[model samples]
Target: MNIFEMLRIDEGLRLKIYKDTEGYYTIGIGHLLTKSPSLNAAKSELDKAIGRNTNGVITKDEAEKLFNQDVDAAVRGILRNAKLKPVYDSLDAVRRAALINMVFQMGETGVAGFTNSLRMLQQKRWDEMAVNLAKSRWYNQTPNRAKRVITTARTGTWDAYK
Candidate 1:
């Protein structure tokens, strides 16, 4: 089965999957919050917090509180969206999941900022896509994570799964 099939891509479920699969933490600002992974709970918490606020952005503290839940739901939501799924399908399952995890942490808009990498994926330019993945704010901010993800993309091994 394809990675998408394996993931059973759905809007709500995707978010949970992402959170359960990929962990997140809040660093900057005084909030200093940490989160593990819990699909539904996180989504509900995040939805409530973000829903309460008018701004599109969530605070580090708020993010920490709802990190796992929100992220999982968000990932699922994006995967369920055809436009996002089309882009998602081009990569291997492990790579796709890793990318989704990154996007979950960074936000869809943040992930979209990797224009060149996205283009490379759309064009099936594997080498370029891998290279592009290595040169982004995500990479700069989290070098080890970036390298691990890029390597997973380049080599279809889920050895480092989650």
Candidate 2:
């Protein structure tokens, strides 16, 4: 089965794609985006906000509601068509999930921008991949989130999920 099917993502989390208050979509599992006591409510608010701000194109509030769904669809499509499992298969589930989440947030092209990092992963060079992950603009912009994902990718542990 595809990643989406494996994850069992529902319709609501398959549409909108989560966005921060600043309107930027999160590219990783982030505390600010995922740590909310009520993810469903948070998504609803984000959707409403998107709708209001985009003038029907996508008000912020509506965007929130739809973000997870949109991301799930986009990620699943990319993984299935791109055959991500081959490359991702060796990694632990958390690491693979984190990479998929990043791809979903950044788009395939954007993720491709991480040439060196991808090379490391392709070569099964975990240490280099972790360092390369920390050197990106994503790391600079979201250090905490980057650290969590990098750690998960390297350690193959769900400790970060805590």
Candidate 3:
């Protein structure tokens, strides 16, 4: 599957704001509304994304649009991260999609914290990368999805998703 398809499964669609597993205020496809500059800004963005208030409800099309935007932001954030740029560029599409999913779930800043893991990734040390990834609190918090992404990174194949 593509990046979008992967994220759609990992982050499931939600038209209305809700607390994520970590209690952050999130909306459509894991978009962290809590990350907005202000609560009012979050409200305005939510309204704009759906094209109408609708008392917090949104159409599938609107949710898909927001998902697309969230995915774009994740991809751009990864590319903009100088530390991760080369690592990302050197990856195959499946591995890249796995990294994108990670950035989508935990922001580029969060992913950047894995300095050693990134180095392993850049070195193409797949087993070491998987071991390092599994040692993180991210894996502790969301083992299922984390394992899938880690496996994709380790194997550089889509078999993990299957």
Whole-model lDDT values for every prediction: 0.54, 0.56, 0.83
52-162: candidate 3 lDDT, tens digit per residue:
765556777877888888889989999999987999999898889888888888889999888999999999999988998999899999999999899988998878777
Worst 10 residues of 3 by lDDT: 33-42
- The list of candidate 2 runs beyond 4 A from truth reads 1-68, 80-85
Ranking by lDDT: 3, 2, 1
Shift of residue 128 alpha carbon in model 2, Å: 1.3
Please estimate how well model 1 matches the true structure, expressed as its whole-model Cα lDDT.
Answer: 0.54
TM-score of each: 0.54, 0.57, 0.89
lDDT: worst 10-residue window of model 1: 8-17
* Cα lDDT tens digits for candidate 2, 1-162: 233432223112323345654454432222123435554655555445444433213434443445556556555655664445456665656667667766655556677667677667767788888988888787887677667667766776656545
Comparing 1 with 2 on lDDT, the higher-scoring candidate is 2
Assess the local accuracy of residue 81 in candidate 1 as a C-alpha lDDT between 0 and 100: 62
Better of 2 and 3 by TM-score: 3
